[PDB]
């Protein structure tokens with residue numbers, strides 16, 4: 001394989017992992033419904049269901065997300081075409097992609113199976129996620145958002161703990177980002193939407209930063225930090241943003257989440273500012289055995 005990954009500025013461990021995923025991916029060509037065998041259900045959300053599946057031709061285990069869409073064949077074909085851009089989204093902070101296709105009313109998005117599931121699943125078992133672990137998660141989310149914005153000119157649009165995947169090798173990766181404008185066009189109890197997105201405002205990277213800040217507070221505290229639908233949304237729009245409880249969390253982490261949760265998107269921190277924030281600089285220097293913590297917390301390996 002003639003790897004052209006020089007632009008990523010990968011460390012040796014990251015380079016080995018990314019080249020290994022891409023090498024496995026070479027066993028996978030056209031994806032068809034008949035070539036899969038369902039192993040189990042990984043989980044489900046509002047828009048789709050995700051199954052752990054065996055791809056019979058390659059022998060690979062994958063996560064197959066199925067989104068029910070039975071629309072004009074030409075517009076569903078445009079969605080499938082737009083999803084093919086995922087073949088160009090190679091980053092240590094973005095879930096690996098095998099392919100996307102349509103079959104009998106469902107769009108399938110086939111991904112790298114992440115054996116640690118999502119941080120939403122981890123949170124249910126851990127209770128609360130330690131601040132040092134959240135430092136590593138924050139680095140991964142900022143780096144993933146920067147990669148999608150700088151290399152592909154897209155915003156995530158759906159940052160939340162269920163869209164941050166982890167594995168037994170200690171990798172942290174984003175999924176469910178808005179790669180397809182038409183899929184966004186064609187498509188509850190908790191909202192991670194920014195106050196400006198709830199009110200109307202055009203999508204900005206700033207809205208993803210709010211979502212990340214809220215997700216960090218939830219994971220730090222062990223509960224959604226904001227109940228009726230109007231009551232919850234009215235709180236986000238018209239009341240002060242949530243804050244981390246003082247004393248239990250470092251001043252750096254409190255300031256970092258505070259900068260993400262500023263109501264005015266112009267005053268709210270941007271990705272460049274967050275990357276050099278004291279919380280990120282401190283967290284990047286820390287030696288944290290994320291893999292060991294994850295495997296111990298959820299009983300992996």
Ligand SMILES: Nc1ncnc2c1ncn2[C@@H]1O[C@H](COP(=O)(O)OP(=O)(O)NP(=O)(O)O)[C@@H](O)[C@H]1O
Nearest residue numbers: 043044045048050063111112113114117118162176
């Ligand atoms: N690649 C993957 N590997 C392992 N688990 C996955 C993978 N992708 C998704 N999951 C799990 O699938 C479950 C359901 O995900 P999903 O259907 O996207 O719901 P959601 O994240 O709550 N909503 P949304 O992303 O907005 O559609 C979650 O519990 C994830 O942990």
Ligand SMILES: CCN(C)c1cc(-c2ccccc2O)nc2nccn12
Nearest residue numbers: 109158175176177178179180183184
């Ligand atoms: C709002 C979440 N949805 C369902 C969504 C998911 C994905 C997608 C899913 C998994 C991995 C990588 C992805 O990109 N891609 C989208 N493009 C537009 C919407 N998309």
Ligand SMILES: [Mg+2]
Nearest residue numbers: 045162163176
């Ligand atoms: Mg999801």
